[PDB]
Amino acid sequence: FMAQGTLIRVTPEQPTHAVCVLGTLTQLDICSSAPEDCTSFSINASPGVVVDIAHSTWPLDPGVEVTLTMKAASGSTGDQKVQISYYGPKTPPVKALLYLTAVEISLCADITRTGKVKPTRAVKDQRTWTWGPCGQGAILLVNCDRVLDSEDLQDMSLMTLSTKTPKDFFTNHTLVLHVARSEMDKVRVFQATRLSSKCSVVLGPKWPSHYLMVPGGKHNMDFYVEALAFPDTDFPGLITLTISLLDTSNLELPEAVVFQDSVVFRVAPWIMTPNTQPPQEVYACEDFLKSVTTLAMKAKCKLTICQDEMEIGYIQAPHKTLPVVFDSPRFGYVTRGPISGLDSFGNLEVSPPVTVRGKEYPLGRILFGDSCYPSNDSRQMHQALQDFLSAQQVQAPVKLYSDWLSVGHVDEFLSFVPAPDRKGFRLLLASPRSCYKLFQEQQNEGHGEALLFEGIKKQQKIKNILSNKTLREHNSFVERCIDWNRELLKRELGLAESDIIDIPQLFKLKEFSKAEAFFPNMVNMLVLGKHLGIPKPFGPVINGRCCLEEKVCSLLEPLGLQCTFINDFFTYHIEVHCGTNVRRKPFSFKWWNMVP
C-alpha cells in the first residue's frame, strides 16, 4: 500500500533539491515555471526513480499528473536526479533539474493485531483504528502496579523505527516523536537502550514531544509503550503516536515539516468473566472450608486460603493477557475513590456469550442493578460507574431492576450455570412461585407439620408458612419484581423460556418494604464448572432429606451439575457477607474482533 506525500515545484532557473520518503507518492509541478515559447516536455530520470504520466513525449497541459516514486533509499545527498526537458516547435530544449534524496522512515507497530510488528505500508489506513477481524490498529495495556528489566517490558507494547538514510542525513534533518497534548497523560513511551532504563522515558505526561537522536545510514531503534489510563467518559481509548521529519538546513528560518507518519493505539478495556468461564483459582476467607475444598478438588480447581468488595477481571493484548483486580474500598490491582448501596460489585453480573436478534456479544453482557425510574427515595448506581463500564464497550451493559431489594444487588435473584445443550448455559432466577408450589405439594401429603429453619436458633412450620396471608402478598409483590427483570433479560440477552430455570426462593420485606432472603439465598451459588456450591437452605426435612435441596437437584442435576450444599455460605455481621471470589479463564475470543 502507498499513501500520498509531497509536491515538488521544478523550475529552469535554479536546480531543486528534495527529500522523498520511500512509500509516498510525489507529484511534480511542471507548468508553474515552464517557459512560454515551449509547448511540450519530456521526462528523464535516474534508474532508481520511477516516473508515471497520466492523461515518450508529452504536452504542457496543466492537467497532466506527473508522479515519482523511489526504488530504494539513497547513499548520498542527491543520489537520484530527474531532468525535465521543455521543447517547442522551434525552441531548443530547456532543461530543469531536480536532485532527489530518498530516505526510509518506517514507524512500525503491531497494527495487524497478530503479535508481529508490521510496517505502516502493510495497511491502507494507518491513522485509524477499526474494530473486527479485518481491522487495523495496535493495542496497549494499562500499567496496573501501585533500570527496566525485560520482565517489566513484557507487558509493554513494541514500536520500532527503521530509518535508512545517507550518512550525513541528520546534519540537516531531525526526527521528532510526539503525542497529542490531550493524550499525553495517558501514555508512556520508553526508548530501548538495548533492555531499557527507568529514566529512558521519551514521551509521557508533561512531555508531549521528543527529538530522536538518529545517526545516518541504516538504523533501527525500539520503543516500549504502556498506557496509563483505562477508557472512561473523558477518554475514548485511542492514543496516536506520530513521528515527524523536520528540515533544519536553514539556520535563520524555523523548522519545516517534510513528512509525518503515525500509529494508532487502542487501550485494551477491562473485561469481566461470567460464571460459565472455567475457574482457575478460588479465594476463600468455620466448617464450610471442608465443603469448598472438596468442591475445589472435584472440579480440579485451585483453592487458596486467607468478597463483594473487589472483582477480578482481565485486560488482553495480542502479546499478553493479564488479570486485573478492581477494588472499591469502603498481579495487577486498581482502586477507586469518592457512595450508594448499589455501587457494589455485588450489583454486577455477566451473561455468558450471547447473540441477540442478530447482534453478537461474544464476551457476554454486563448486568447491573437499578431503579425502574428516578425518584426521591430511589437508589441508582453512581453515574461515573455506569459510564465507566459502558466506556469499555465490549460488554455492553444492561440496566436491570434491583432497587426493590433491601441491599439492591442483582446477584441476589440472578445467576448463570453451564449447560451442555441449547445456548450452552442456563439462567437461574429466584422464584417464590416455585417455592410455594413445592410447599403446597408437601402439605397435600400431610407434611404441613414439617419445620423450616431446622438446625438454628426461631423455627417455623410449613403449615404456618403456607397460610401466612401477609407473607403471601409480600412474595406476590416480589414475584412481580423478578418477573419484570425476566422480561428484560429475555429481551436484551435474547432468551427463550427453555433457557430459564426457577430456583425456589422465599422473600420477606424489611425496612421500607424492601426485600430480603427469607432463607439462605440459593440462587447466589458458587459455580465452579459442573460443580455447584449452593447455600444450605435448611428447609423442612421430609424423609430425612431437605425438600428444598430435593427440588434444586431435580432442576440442576439433569444439566450434569453436581450440587453440594454449603452450611455456612453466608455470615451475618451483627450485614450479610460471603468470603469467596473466583478467578476464571478469560474468553478465548479476542475482544478486538468484536464490533460493538
Active site (catalytic) residues:
308, 409, 411, 578
Residue 326 binds which entry of ligand A1A9P, ligand 3YZ, none, CB below 5-8 Å type-dependent: ligand A1A9P
Gap sites in the chain (C to N > 2.5 Å), preceding residue numbers: 55, 146, 194, 285, 306, 330, 338, 457, 574
User: What count of Cα atoms within 13 Å lies in the side-chain half-sphere of residue 380?
Assistant: 13
CB atoms near residue 251 (< 10 Å) = 5
Cα–Cα distance, 241 to 177 (Å, whole number):
7
Site for ligand 3YZ in 422-481 (CB under 6 A): 453, 456
Number of residues that bind ligand A1A9P (CB under 6 A): 18
**Closer residue to ligand 3YZ (CB): 512 or 572:** 572
CA distances from 418 to 280, 350, 540, 581 (A): 16, 13, 28, 18
Annotated binding residues? 143, 145, 152, 155, 307, 309, 311, 327-328, 345, 348-349
Tell me the window of 144-152, 264-272, 405-413, 484-492 that interacts with ligand 3YZ (CB under 6 A): 405-413
Cα–Cα distance, 275 to 366 (Å, whole number):
12
Q: Is residue 343 close enough to count as binding ligand A1A9P by CB under 6 A?
A: yes
Q: Which of 39, 587, 55, 556 is nearest to 316 (CA)?
A: 587
CB 213 within 8 A of CB 157: no
Residue 388 binds which entry of ligand 3YZ, ligand A1A9P, none, CB below 5-8 Å type-dependent: ligand A1A9P
Q: Is residue 406 close enough to count as binding ligand 3YZ by CB under 6 A?
A: yes
Contact with ligand 3YZ (CB under 6 A) among 226, 261, 412, 502: 412
Cα–Cα distance, 538 to 541 (Å, whole number):
8
Tell me the window of 295-303, 315-323, 349-357, 382-390 that interacts with ligand A1A9P (CB under 6 A): 382-390
Site for ligand A1A9P in 197-236 (CB under 6 A): 229-230, 232
Contact with ligand A1A9P (CB under 6 A) among 345, 416, 439, 592: 345
Q: Which of 197, 194, 108 is nearest to 148 (CA)?
A: 197
**Closer residue to ligand 3YZ (CB): 155 or 412:** 412
**SS3 for 393?**
coil
Q: Is residue 404 close enough to count as binding ligand A1A9P by CB under 6 A?
A: no
Tell me the window of 47-55, 66-74, 341-349, 566-574 that interacts with ligand A1A9P (CB under 6 A): 341-349
**Closer residue to ligand A1A9P (CB): 98 or 334:** 334
150: exposed, middle or buried (C-beta count within 10 Å: 0-12, 13-18, 19+)? exposed
| Cell, residue 258 | 517534510
Cα–Cα distance, 212 to 208 (Å, whole number):
13
Q: Is residue 370 close enough to count as binding ligand A1A9P by CB under 6 A?
A: no
Q: Residues 140-159: x/- map of binding to ligand A1A9P (CB under 6 A)?
A: --x-x---------------
Backbone angles phi, psi at 576, to 5 degrees: -95, 130
Residue 348 binds which entry of ligand A1A9P, ligand 3YZ, none, CB below 5-8 Å type-dependent: ligand A1A9P
CA distances from 163 to 80, 111, 242 (A): 18, 19, 15
Cα–Cα distance, 338 to 77 (Å, whole number):
60
Cα–Cα distance, 81 to 49 (Å, whole number):
8
Q: Is residue 581 close enough to count as binding ligand 3YZ by CB under 6 A?
A: no
**Closer residue to ligand 3YZ (CB): 61 or 454:** 454
* Cα pseudo-dihedral 345, 508, 372, 382, rounded to 10: -30
Backbone angles phi, psi at 432, to 5 degrees: -60, -35
CB 389 within 8 A of CB 366: yes
Residue number, nearest CB to ligand 3YZ: 346
Residue 570 binds which entry of ligand A1A9P, ligand 3YZ, none, CB below 5-8 Å type-dependent: ligand 3YZ
Q: Which of 14, 24, 37 is nearest to 87 (CA)?
A: 37
Of all helices (H) and strands (E), which one includes residue 295? helix 288-298
Site for ligand A1A9P in 4-23 (CB under 6 A): none
Amino acid making up residue 35 = P
Kindly state the DSSP code that residue 352 receives in the 8-state scheme: P
Residue 156 binds which entry of ligand 3YZ, ligand A1A9P, none, CB below 5-8 Å type-dependent: none
Contact with ligand A1A9P (CB under 6 A) among 336, 491, 510, 545: 336
Number of residues that bind ligand 3YZ (CB under 6 A): 18
Residue 516 binds which entry of ligand A1A9P, ligand 3YZ, none, CB below 5-8 Å type-dependent: ligand 3YZ
Beta strands in 192-295 (DSSP E): 201-203, 209-212, 217-227, 238-247, 256-267, 279-284
Q: Is residue 407 close enough to count as binding ligand 3YZ by CB under 6 A?
A: yes
Contact with ligand 3YZ (CB under 6 A) among 186, 409, 447, 486: 409
Site for ligand 3YZ in 501-560 (CB under 6 A): 516-517, 519-521, 524
**Closer residue to ligand A1A9P (CB): 63 or 329:** 329
* Cα pseudo-dihedral 55, 61, 63, 69, rounded to 10: 70
Q: How far is the CB of 368 from ligand A1A9P (least distance, A)?
A: 7
Cα–Cα distance, 382 to 379 (Å, whole number):
9
- Angle separating helix axes 547-556 and 432-443, nearest 10 degrees: 120
Q: How far is the CB of 570 from ligand 3YZ (least distance, A)?
A: 4
Annotated binding residues for Ca(2+)? 143, 145, 152, 155, 307, 309, 311, 327-328, 345, 348-349
Q: Is residue 390 close enough to count as binding ligand A1A9P by CB under 6 A?
A: no
Q: Is residue 361 close enough to count as binding ligand A1A9P by CB under 6 A?
A: no
**Closer residue to ligand 3YZ (CB): 190 or 519:** 519
Cα–Cα distance, 428 to 522 (Å, whole number):
10
| Cell, residue 563 | 450440587
Q: Is residue 385 close enough to count as binding ligand A1A9P by CB under 6 A?
A: yes
Q: Is residue 334 close enough to count as binding ligand A1A9P by CB under 6 A?
A: yes
Q: Is residue 137 close enough to count as binding ligand 3YZ by CB under 6 A?
A: no
Residue 380 binds which entry of ligand A1A9P, ligand 3YZ, none, CB below 5-8 Å type-dependent: none
Residues that bind ligand 3YZ (CB under 6 A): 308, 346, 406-407, 409, 411-412, 453, 456, 516-517, 519-521, 524, 570, 572, 576
Residues contributing to the site for ligand A1A9P (CB under 6 A):
142, 144, 229-230, 232, 326, 328, 334-336, 343-345, 347-348, 384-385, 388
